[PDB]
């Protein structure tokens, strides 16, 4: 999509994530873990329902209209009755076809956008303590135990706490 996250810099999706649409997987001192992100999942879901409801909005009701099927050949006025309905139908068919094309396009970029926003938001929080391995994974340069991972995910991580550790550990020169 437009942002290049889903099916982009994130090589693929996780079939394993059964509890949300976007989320985190980590390796840290205490082991490996996975966890769904609920705020971005709710954001993508709310917008998709938003558009879904606007489409499922009010059916117009019509009662006595014109006849659309004929049993005899009449000529001029029947030819018109047929033309009015056939042109109404192609105009409404074009309309449905463009609607789901536009809508579908926008839904793939909207969810692409939410993946990207979670990523960026996570990036900003880690400040100088992590580097982007460029595949959706941040390498954190300091010991980050499971509570550290929970603070990043619940959004309370304080970068200053580990800045000196991370920074030292990051700008090591030695080969």
């Amino acid at each position: 999509g437009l942002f290049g996250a889903i099916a982009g810099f994130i090589e693929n999706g996780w079939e394993g994530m059964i509890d949300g649409w976007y989320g985190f997987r980590h390796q840290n001192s205490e082991g490996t873990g996975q966890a769904a992100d609920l705020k971005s999942t709710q954001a993508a879901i709310d917008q998709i329902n938003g558009k879904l409801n606007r489409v499922i909005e009010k059916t117009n009701e019509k009662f006595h209209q014109i006849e659309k099927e004929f049993s005899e050949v009449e000529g001029r006025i029947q030819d018109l009755e047929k033309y009015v309905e056939d042109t109404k139908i192609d105009l409404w068919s074009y309309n449905a076809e463009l609607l789901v094309a536009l809508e579908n396009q926008h839904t793939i970029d909207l969810t692409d956008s939410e993946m990207n926003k979670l990523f960026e938001k996570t990036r900003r929080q880690l400040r100088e303590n992590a580097e982007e391995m460029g595949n959706g994974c941040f390498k954190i340069y300091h010991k980050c135990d499971n509570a550290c991972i929970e603070s990043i995910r619940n959004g309370t991580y304080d970068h200053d706490v580990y800045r000196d550790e991370a920074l030292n550990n990051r700008f090591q020169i030695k080969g």
Partner: protein, 328 residues
């Protein structure tokens, strides 16, 4: 801030999205089929097969068309003063009374079907010097010969068919629909036998319109024993106007008026069974649900229905792109 640690390590955090094993292809502006995690159908494509009898008054015509129900074919006498939101005409329907034709049948079927009522009021017309209540063996009512319950066939009294000239004022505050007709005899002998004069005439007028029909003598195909035809006509009379009927032969006179009303009534041709359920959208194929925005069941609908479309499936993606790792 904290003190120098004795361990030096790193961690890996990776962001990602879900994916499903299955997944639906959907259309896009740049793609004809692309797979998303989930989608919804926006085209309703199936009917139940039955017209739900609720919420609209669905009147089954059974083996009566609305025009025979209006004119009062004996076999349709069941519908007298009936009322409907949707009159359903069945293809099995037949007529079984004097052979008639309705020049511009289609408008008379329309304007009655929209009115939605068949309430008839008998008015005291006085036909002076003519024999009332004629009937025919082509329209039996019981063992006897008969005629449309709502029309009155006038034949001469004795040596005369006078010039009938009658009036009926619209003193009420609603429009009155009058149905009347004229008889086209098969032969010149039939003409003179029934109406004396060699050429009848019917002029029916209000102070804003007038129509004169002269009969047409000639053999037509045998239908229920008859080679003659009657042709039906209508005159709406607005409040405060007057009907004047002038004729010196071949008049098939009105017996009063049908009330006209403004409504949401229509007529539909369907052999779908009526069943007990509630549904708002009716289609000749039976009812259909109106949860989707578009439908493809039939272009003929009545009620709160989805816009008919040509496509028979149109999937709105309700999920992100599906990019599985295993695949299948």
């Amino acid at each position: 801030q904290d003190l120098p640690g004795n361990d030096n390590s790193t961690a890996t955090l990776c962001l990602g999205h879900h994916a499903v094993p299955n997944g639906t292809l959907v259309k896009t502006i740049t793609d004809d089929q692309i797979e998303v995690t989930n989608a919804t159908e926006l085209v309703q494509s199936s009917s139940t097969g039955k017209i739900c009898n609720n919420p609209h008054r669905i009147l089954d015509g059974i083996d009566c068309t609305l025009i025979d129900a209006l004119l009062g074919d004996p076999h349709c006498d069941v519908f007298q003063n009936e009322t409907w939101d949707l009159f359903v005409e069945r293809s099995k329907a037949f007529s079984n009374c004097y052979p008639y034709d309705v020049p511009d049948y289609a408008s008379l079927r329309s304007l009655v079907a929209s009115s939605g009522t068949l309430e008839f009021i008998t008015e005291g017309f006085t036909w002076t010097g003519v024999t009332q209540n004629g009937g025919s063996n082509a329209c039996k009512r019981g063992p006897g010969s008969g005629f449309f319950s709502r029309l009155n066939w006038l034949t001469k009294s004795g040596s005369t068919y006078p010039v009938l000239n009658v009036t009926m004022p619209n003193n009420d505050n609603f429009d009155k629909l009058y149905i009347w007709g004229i008889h086209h005899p098969s032969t010149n002998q039939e003409q003179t036998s029934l109406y004396v004069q060699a050429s009848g005439r019917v002029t029916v007028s209000t102070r804003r319109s007038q129509q004169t029909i002269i009969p047409n003598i000639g053999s037509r195909p045998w239908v229920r024993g008859q080679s003659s035809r009657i042709s039906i006509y209508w005159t709406i009379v607005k409040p405060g106007d007057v009907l004047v009927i002038n004729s010196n032969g071949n008049l098939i006179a009105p017996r009063g008026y049908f009330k006209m009303r403004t409504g949401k009534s229509s007529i539909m041709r369907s052999d779908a069974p009526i069943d007990t359920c509630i549904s708002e959208c009716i289609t000749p194929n039976g009812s259909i649900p109106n949860d989707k925005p578009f439908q493809n069941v039939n272009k003929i609908t009545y009620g709160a229905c989805p816009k008919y479309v040509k496509q028979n499936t149109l999937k709105l993606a309700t999920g992100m792109r599906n990019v599985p790792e295993k695949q299948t």
